[PDB]
């Protein structure tokens, strides 16, 4: 039962939102893939009126390119307790966000007969802390 219940890394999202371009270079250096620009919605008076315009830049890391990035990313930030989501996700920061999840998340992300993951099979905040604590660092 434990094997088909023990978590894993799904997608590590690194984000750099300026609003006024240069940030694409340093991510193609540290991660290992091509980056993508981020647009926005609604008119803001802080010289951000245009809708279709490059404001940010991000990257999503799957499988091996995710774990290899985290070996150098985790021993940098001082991990806390009130830095976790109810679904069992954390964000540290430049922004770095990791989406940890259970062995059956294809069900919610697929097309043919999709369903949402029940509250009994969803990742718990405390069960998420215990997973990261088990791989090269501390909590609190």
């Amino acid at each position: 039962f434990h094997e088909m219940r023990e978590p894993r890394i799904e997608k590590v999202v690194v984000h750099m939102g300026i609003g006024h371009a240069n940030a694409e270079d340093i991510l193609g250096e540290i991660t290992g893939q091509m980056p993508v620009r981020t647009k926005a919605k609604r008119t803001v008076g802080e010289f951000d009126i245009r809708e279709g315009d490059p404001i940010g830049a991000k990257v999503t890391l799957r499988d091996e390119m995710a774990e290899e990035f985290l070996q150098t990313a985790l021993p940098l930030a001082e991990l806390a307790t009130s830095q976790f989501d109810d679904t069992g996700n954390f964000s540290f920061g430049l922004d770095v966000t990791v989406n940890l999840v259970r062995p059956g998340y294809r069900v919610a992300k697929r097309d043919k007969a999709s369903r949402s993951i029940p509250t009994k099979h969803r990742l718990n905040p405390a069960d998420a802390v215990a997973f990261i604590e088990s791989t090269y660092d501390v909590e609190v």
Binding site: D111, K112, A113, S114, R115
Partner: protein, 186 residues
């Protein structure tokens, strides 16, 4: 749920199975839907006509009952997909079905896919389905040349069950030969 104002979707939309908007367009033709549904292990091919209390299936075809003719190879692949489609149209020729349309439902319209192999198979069975010859797979990816050029990149075997070493896409040719025969027990 929230109150009488709340609108719960239609059952097969709630279940996320049938796409009613695209399904409507299929029914507008009058011709029967060749329901092409995939699976991880197998592949299905149904011939469905519209009825009073629900949809009437006149000729089905699962890749499980393909083994019943002379197949020891896997069931969820490109060589299998054509032959499941060929069987379906052949059974349908004997049911009075002269023409049909293709229904893929929630399956994506990607060039040279398993659904477009089922469609290709059913047309070759004598049925008149609206297609586009260049969107279909070339005789070779339908035969199984892509799986042979993967088993050439060996070191470790592809198949686990004791079938063969370098893989035989000739089994495709060996089946289409005896399916074009009128003696065969459908």
């Amino acid at each position: 749920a929230t109150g009488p104002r709340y609108k719960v979707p239609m059952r097969r939309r709630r279940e996320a199975r049938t796409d009613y908007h695209q399904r409507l367009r299929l029914l507008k033709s009058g011709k029967p839907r060749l329901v092409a549904r995939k699976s991880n292990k197998h592949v299905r091919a149904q011939l469905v006509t519209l009825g009073p209390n629900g949809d009437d299936t006149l000729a089905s075809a699962h890749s499980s009952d393909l083994a019943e003719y002379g197949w020891e190879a896997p069931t969820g692949n490109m060589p299998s997909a054509y032959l499941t489609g060929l069987l379906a149209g052949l059974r349908a020729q004997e049911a009075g079905v002269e023409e049909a349309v293709l229904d893929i439902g929630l399956n994506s319209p990607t060039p040279g896919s398993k659904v477009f192999a089922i469609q290709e198979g059913a047309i070759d069975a004598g049925l008149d389905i609206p297609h586009n010859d260049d969107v279909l797979a070339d005789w070779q990816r339908t035969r199984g040349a892509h799986i042979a050029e993967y088993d050439e990149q060996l070191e470790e075997p592809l198949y686990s069950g004791d079938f063969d070493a370098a893989d035989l896409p000739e089994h495709f040719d060996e089946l289409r030969e005896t399916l074009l025969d009128g003696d065969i027990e459908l």
